[PDB]
Amino acid sequence: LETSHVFCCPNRVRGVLNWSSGPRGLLAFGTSCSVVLYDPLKRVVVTNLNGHTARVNCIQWICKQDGSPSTELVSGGSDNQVIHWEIEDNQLLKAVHLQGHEGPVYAVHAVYQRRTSDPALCTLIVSAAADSAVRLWSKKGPEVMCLQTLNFGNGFALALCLSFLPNTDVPILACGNDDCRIHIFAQQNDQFQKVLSLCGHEDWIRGVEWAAFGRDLFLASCSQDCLIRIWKLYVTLETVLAGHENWVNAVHWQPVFYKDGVLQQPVRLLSASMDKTMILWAPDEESGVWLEQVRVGEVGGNTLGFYDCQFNEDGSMIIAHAFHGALHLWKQNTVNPREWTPEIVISGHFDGVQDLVWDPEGEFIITVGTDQTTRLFAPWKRKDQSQVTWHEIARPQIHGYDLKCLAMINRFQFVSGADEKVLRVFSAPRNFVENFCAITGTEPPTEDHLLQNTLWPEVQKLYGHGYEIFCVTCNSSKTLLASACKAAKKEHAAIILWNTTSWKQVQNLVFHSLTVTQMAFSPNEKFLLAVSRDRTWSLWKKQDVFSLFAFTNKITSVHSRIIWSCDWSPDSKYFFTGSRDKKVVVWGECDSTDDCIEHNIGPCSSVLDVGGAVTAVSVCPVLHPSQRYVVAVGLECGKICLYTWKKTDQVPEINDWTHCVETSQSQSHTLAIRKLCWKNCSGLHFASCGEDHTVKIHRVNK
Amino acid sequence: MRNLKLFRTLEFRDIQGPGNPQCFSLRTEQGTVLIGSEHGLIEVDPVSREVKNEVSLVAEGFLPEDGSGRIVGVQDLLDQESVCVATASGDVILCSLSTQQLECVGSVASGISVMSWSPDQELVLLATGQQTLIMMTKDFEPILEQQIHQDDFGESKFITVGWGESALPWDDHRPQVTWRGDGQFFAVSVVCPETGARKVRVWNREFALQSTSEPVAGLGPALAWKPSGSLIASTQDKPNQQDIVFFEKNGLLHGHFTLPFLKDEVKVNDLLWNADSSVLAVWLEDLQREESSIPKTCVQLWTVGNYHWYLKQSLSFSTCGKSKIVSLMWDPVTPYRLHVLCQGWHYLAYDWHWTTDRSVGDNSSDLSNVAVIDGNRVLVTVFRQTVVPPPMCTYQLLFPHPVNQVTFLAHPQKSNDLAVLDASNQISVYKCKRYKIQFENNEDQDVNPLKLGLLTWIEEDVFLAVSHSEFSPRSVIHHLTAAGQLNVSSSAAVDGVIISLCCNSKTKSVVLQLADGQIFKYLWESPSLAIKPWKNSGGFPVRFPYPCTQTELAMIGEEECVLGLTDRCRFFINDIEVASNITSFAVYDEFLLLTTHSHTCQCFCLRVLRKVERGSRIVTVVPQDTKLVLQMPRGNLEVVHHR
Amino acid sequence: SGIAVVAVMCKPHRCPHISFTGNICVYCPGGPDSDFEYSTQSYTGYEPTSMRAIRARYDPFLQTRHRIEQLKQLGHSVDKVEFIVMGGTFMALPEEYRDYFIRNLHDALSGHTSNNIYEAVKYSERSLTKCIGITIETRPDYCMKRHLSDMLTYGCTRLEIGVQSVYEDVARDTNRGHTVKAVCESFHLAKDSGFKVVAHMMPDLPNVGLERDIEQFTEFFENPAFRPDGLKLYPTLVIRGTGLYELWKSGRYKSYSPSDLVELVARILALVPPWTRVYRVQRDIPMPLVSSGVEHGNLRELALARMKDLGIQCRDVRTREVPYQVELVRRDYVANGGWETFLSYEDPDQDILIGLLRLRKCSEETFRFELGGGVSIVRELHVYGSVQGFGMLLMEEAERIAREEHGSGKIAVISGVGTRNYYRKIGYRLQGPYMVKMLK
Ligand SMILES: C[C@H]1O[C@@H](n2cnc3c(N)ncnc32)[C@H](O)[C@@H]1O
Ligand code: MET
Ligand code: SF4
């Protein structure tokens, strides 16, 4: 069971994006409650570093002394915990947890110690939390402990940096603060006496950074007062200033890179601001007065952003992290040094995904998110490489309401619902068809073209439901819709059937007394099943226009609580129901074509007990000999399991169900699952989404 | 914040004539009562000091002819010089004065239960026995005759969208009519034969049925429209308590208050408003306990402050029959004056004025106390320390009986005590933060309710009271002192009626005021207790042109002087009349403070112009910190520092 | 130099009393069920705040930033701001959305990114751009103890409870949903909580005559039950899409004559007490949408002109607000079972106002744990003049009369965020949401 593809986007925090310096380098931005390793060479992520319970805020690599690519890193989240991560080759060996720091952790830094006697990679960690506190952590081997702490009373720490004195090995610490008074001093028990506290800025200082020293320790200072000040340390201090309007929040010097055997240390800076601007200050040849090299950014547009900017290896590119979770990568033109171009990167929903559905042909997947957006994902064939990558192709609509349900009728026709009373229908335009055929058989678009030039029209507007739409479905022939509304009374909660060719109500089945969670037609197209929050289900049969044929009162229901999902069988002979009672029940009726027996509906098979709440049950569409059924279950904690069911002879409760492969730690969602959609077959792959802002495509074969 | 006070008890008794008087009216413009009895109409002038006798008596005994034939209404015709009279038989006549001639003007085939007149005396209404109210023009021209038991709601219906106990047994079936102050609407009360309970209806001036009463349970047979504003009072006897409620023009209940009696002990007879919509008079009757033969017949006066109905004064009457009230009314020309006619041919006139019960003193140990009466409780506020808004108080004292009068001792250096007179003619003394009850003395002689006049506390053991004689009105000063209080002495009956009994804490000087205007200096410690005309600079002619509601004694310059203020915004200083715009004033430690009605506050000192809101009345002054406490009509106070 | 007002609006949502009844109030225009797209509630979607909010798709952060930028552009400085959350019944949404909204507001103002509301407020306390307070509107049936506690946590310091008319038949016939007694109880609880209540009134309801309106307003300013601190006038407008529109179309309702309306406004203004403020006298609904109602926007000016003509004059806070000979004036009264005090500084002859304060003894119905020992309270301090400084004098005198008259031992103040530091500088400590000082 291998995870083919994953889609996600970074969190909306300062300093969530970090990149190792080296021949390869690695990005380590954080999604909801996990850290993502993603190669930037227009490739896919490699692993997922799960483990945090709450949101993840700060990520930083451990700088390597000898120019090697980084090996370990640190992440501090909102779970009051700081995690040190070690990987050998994309493998997540021996993560380490660190406790303390009540309140969210909002700053971390890590440095390799210069120990001479013990070369066992002695590491130093500084952590600043939301409790006006900063603490230390020295790690040697697997030995971790805290050290001298520092309270700020009411003040808070905003930016942290750590380095060494130019000649003597002295660990120096520069802390940002909320009082325009960045404090630079020593920290250890042997050296923790504050020496100086600069006061150059006139606002909250959101950035400080120890620079690569030619011969004196250069230092950057960045505050909300729209000023950047460079301070030189030698035990003496100097001061230089710069100029650029609006909030400035991201400053970093160019690191050292090995140019053909010789390390190189240029002089350059990099500033990212809320006004959609990013600057490349450089000292002057004549008098060393810093002057701009190039203005880059969406100047004059909307959606003010650029929380972060980070500087590529050897100045090849620059990456930037914006307000709405969208990255921006710029690449240098070797032919023209004074010219840069945007580049293609990863994307994804910035809020919990709710639903998706496969392409009827099997090429693309469409997602809707509580971020009030609809997005489309399709693979890229390129021209030569056997490796195939998937990318965000189109953004059909940016709605003003949340989205909950979605259905597909034609290959370019889909119906969407929202937390409102109406239903919407969308059709692909003609430009999209040609652009897609060029992509599948030009290149994936960048961010701005997606944001502005890519939308879909509205064709219809379905009325007359009464309340918020909660579920949608379609039949096999793609000719009859079905929807339900969120309701708290028997009258309101009713099933409405529409006609696809006319968009008019046809019939108004009403049997349930509370909200209907999910419905499903049958491949036989002679039944329709609906489970409700009333801890019960109903089955409706078309007559030769639908009538009631099955029934389930309170007593005749094995489930005790809300039934969450339901599914049919490819032979249209049995069906399955998963509830919040940690139990899945398959009901067998064997009734198809003509059955003159009245009712006779029974479970006919055993009951299981998964580890937790069930929110998605799916049945693989293809059938194999031995009449052996397979079921995919999406649990609540975030894991997915596969089970196999075979009909027994006389006793249901004897080895009725067999176990199969389970999702491992790396390939498992974090918060909850919402759908399990198998790829269409008969002219293995399936997709899963949830509230992790992430979409995953899996693969398995026997 | 303010209280009523009695200053005139005109009384004429032993009226002779026909038997069992039934109803009466009043004549203004040098007129008097016009009692009409079973035989005819009697005119009596009691106003004259030495003359209280019938004038131009007439008889008509041949219309009812020895039968019941009760007169259902008597009304003066203002300047027309005639008295319209309606009899129960169904005849309306127009009599005449000095001519003793009759004039039958209208006849009705059914009994005329109630006859009422418009305030402007232009339209008159007849409640026939046919349940058909009728309008007559001023000169008895028929206008309209409408049924009273019509069922439809009327005109002022409610526009609505689709989104969403019988009558009291002791109530005689009898219609009651009223009018509003401006004469634009009127109200009719009647029992509903369909239902069996009272049900009010409101008519426009031109017989346009406006609204009908909501079906409230336990409605009583009372009806009284407040002259100004829009309130109509009634009773809503509930299973647990007895309450007085209000309607409005649309016919909906709105606000009420509670009568402080038992569940089933009394009943309501009638409700009357004063001349300016400021005092409500309620008449009650003892329903049960025939052993004492209705020992209680109380009339009470109620006022409103910050939406709190106080109980100001209470009057008691026996129901023996010899002294039993048969009618009562308010003077339509001047406020705070009511007239009462009893069964035994007795006529009474009561006059009140309006005052605050301050506590003057020296510069130290003063506390500037202020006292307010409310039911059987007294609210005392110490304005030196805490400036409490009116509805609350610095502290509260409770009594078993209702209170009628309070006073502060005038002894300097001890002006921190008070004497209270209850309705049971008992005196309670409170003396020096909190207070403990010192004494509850009982009077020796008391025969008529509310007979003691102005009660003044001069020395820590003496009290001065005023009693008014019946024949040849003469005022007698009583000295009350004892260890049970004995009327030790009674001064000579002076010629006339005394209005003011102001005293000075300094020099222990007492000043008397007569109705006509002379000022007399009486010596309470005199061996002869003789009175003396007030001493002016020379000739001693001091006489106020008009009686003064408030009289004060202040030492100006070196000698003493008398200051007076009347109800017509006139200020007198030993008969000088400095100016005529003042509304209120006060004197304290050579400081004269006074409003001006021209929105200013003069601060003349004895040996300057600030700005004030509308209608500010001075309440109290504290020379310490030099702070004075104005009061606005809406209820709030206001402390200001002049200097 | 001066505080800047920032108005934000919420997402559309149905009012709560639609379930057990049939519909919403018979006159409120707009709403999710109305014919105006993105009509939150009581708003067509044409006032500047309306499309200003729509442009951000009802995002707190974006709306705050856009308004701040606009104000900064036109010279105005933004050191001090005051938030106003409009858009119908806010305290009916699920808790999660409310927490989201308020936390986003605070973080937008500050810059720090928070998880819960507590971290947001802790960080915003340290900001360089200070927030004086927040104001929200709420129906009386949603102002119980828990709601008040939540409002205290958010830092809101001023309610906008709307009681349309004192008569109960009017409420029951317009399907308002509650009773007047509930309104009085809500005022009682809010006043003993320590807020600054401002009420809404509508002087043209159906089945209400001119005489009824005058009487009800006189009672409103005389009855110790109501006696509010600030008043807004909203003359009724007949907007399409409401039950009132159906009534008017059916030829069963008529609007007041323009001269009659102007005169009524004149009398109401003349009757206003000195210590009560008049925020507004009109509604900003676009003119060509109303079928019947007010004449034009020139309503305040006509009222003042007629009042000057008839010899009456208005003495409210706004008109009397702006060396000169100043003096201390003190006023006291009663409201909702509480002893209210109105210490102020003013110049009599030129009837101008400089500094003011609001004290109140705490009743026996108080429930907040910080107030359980006879604590006083300071509902509001406001100074806009210049000279020690007047604020020192007002606080000193208020503490004096609290220690002496009220006989209290502890004093508490309600404040925003920067005001917390201001009061801490004069010797206060923070307890709960209040700023407390032990008064001997
Ligand atoms: C925001 C304020 O608008 C008032 N309001 C509701 N409907 C109308 C209308 N048709 N015209 C004017 N004001 C109205 C509400 O009563 C609320 O107090
Ligand atoms: C916007 S209407 C006024 C606010 C709230 N809906 C109320 O009626 O109390
Ligand atoms: S409660 Fe307020 S906002 Fe809601 S419908 Fe009624 S008036 Fe409009």
Numbering used by the authors:
A (entry chain B): 6 to 239, 273 to 479, 543 to 645, 654 to 792, 805 to 823
B (entry chain A): 1 to 164, 186 to 453, 484 to 534, 543 to 666, 687 to 722
C (entry chain C): 85 to 406, 417 to 481, 495 to 547
What does the study report here?
The Elongator complex is responsible for introducing 5-carboxymethyl at wobble uridine bases (cm5U34) in eukaryotic tRNAs. The highly conserved complex is composed of two copies of each of its six individual protein subunits, Elp1-Elp6, which form two discrete subcomplexes known as Elp123 and Elp456. In this study, we present a series of cryo-EM structures of human ELP123 in complex with tRNA and cofactors at four different stages of the reaction.
In addition, we prepared samples of ELP123 without tRNA and solved its structure at 3.58 Å resolution. The reconstructed map only resolves the WD40 domains of ELP1 as well as ELP2 and ELP3. Notably, the acetyl-CoA loop is not visible in the tRNA-free ELP123 structure, suggesting that it is highly mobile and does not block the acetyl-CoA pocket the way the analogous loop does in bacterial DmcElp3. Here, we show that the analogous loop does not block the acetyl-CoA binding site in human ELP3. We present the initial state (ELP123–SAM), substrate-bound state (ELP123–tRNA–acetyl-CoA/ECA), and the post-modification reaction (ELP123–tRNA–DCA), which enable us to propose a sequential order of action. First, the initial state of ELP123 exhibits high structural mobility when it probes for potential tRNA substrates. We observed the presence of an iron-sulfur cluster in all obtained structures, coordinated by three highly conserved cysteines (Cys99, Cys109, and Cys112). 5ʹ-dA and methionine are the products of the reductive SAM cleavage reaction triggered by tRNA binding. Together, our structural analyses suggest that in human ELP123–SAM cleavage proceeds constitutively in the rSAM domain and independent of acetyl-CoA hydrolysis by the KAT domain.
